[PDB]
């Protein structure tokens, strides 16, 4: 299947990404608390529902929320300010809260059932969010021996997510809170996000020498994100 691309709402970030985030890929955004990772997730969960000529994929959303940070009111705001019906946009976002990392892993299997259910509808799943990908793994796998064990479990979880992305033509979007680099990562594309002044945010592609080497700049607004 040919890949698809979901606009982020920022022309600058879209150019950095070659048009938007890709299906059949895992895009990881990482950065400090408050950098805007979850704002980008909320924005994508609306943008994906737009028709293709407007930068969406007419798609539904699966959202695995590990920090109780999904906000339907934020979806509503973004949708209304983009000309969309907030209640209809919310209808096509299917959210589960992950209690711990083992539940988070099982939820990926449950996600496949929802993906299959919607595959032949007019709004197949096109976006799968895991926010936060790493928070439960960080709290549970800690101390001597944990680096190897945590990395193995996280790699297996990411492999399961890669399979859904690739088998069902879905863009997987995951968030990871960092601080202040030595660990392996298996996402397709890694985007470092940081906060500038007020509502301004700066994005850079990490370890992607074949792709744009500049930086995108965008603002958090009532439309989600915009230039």
């Amino acid at each position: 299947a040919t890949i698809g691309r979901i606009s982020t709402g920022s022309k600058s970030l879209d150019k950095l990404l070659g048009g938007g985030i890709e299906t059949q890929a895992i895009t990881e955004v990482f950065g400090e608390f408050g950098s805007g990772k979850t704002q980008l997730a909320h924005t994508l969960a609306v943008m994906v529902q737009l028709p293709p000529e407007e930068g969406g994929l007419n798609g539904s959303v699966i959202w695995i929320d590990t920090e109780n940070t999904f906000r339907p009111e934020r979806i509503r705001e973004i949708a209304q300010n983009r000309g969309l019906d907030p209640d209809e946009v919310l209808k096509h976002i299917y959210v589960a809260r992950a209690f711990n990392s083992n539940h988070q892993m099982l939820l990926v299997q449950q996600a496949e059932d929802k993906i299959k259910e919607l595959l032949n509808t007019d709004r197949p799943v096109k976006l799968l969010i895991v926010d936060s990908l790493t928070s439960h793994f960080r709290s549970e796998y800690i101390g001597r021996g944990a680096l190897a064990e945590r990395q193995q479990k996280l790699a297996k979880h990411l492999a399961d997510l890669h399979r859904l992305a690739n088998l069902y033509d879905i863009a997987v979007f995951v968030t990871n809170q960092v601080q202040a680099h030595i660990l392996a990562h298996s996402a397709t594309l890694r985007v470092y996000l940081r906060k500038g002044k007020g509502g301004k945010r700066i994005a850079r592609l990490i370890d992607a020498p074949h792709l744009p080497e500049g930086e995108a700049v965008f603002s958090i607004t009532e439309k989600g994100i915009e230039d």
Binding site: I62, W63, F70, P72, I75, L90, K91, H92, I93, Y94, V95, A96, L107, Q110, A111, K114
Partner: peptide
């Protein structure tokens, strides 16, 4: 999962 549950619809929002």
């Amino acid at each position: 999962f549950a619809t929002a």
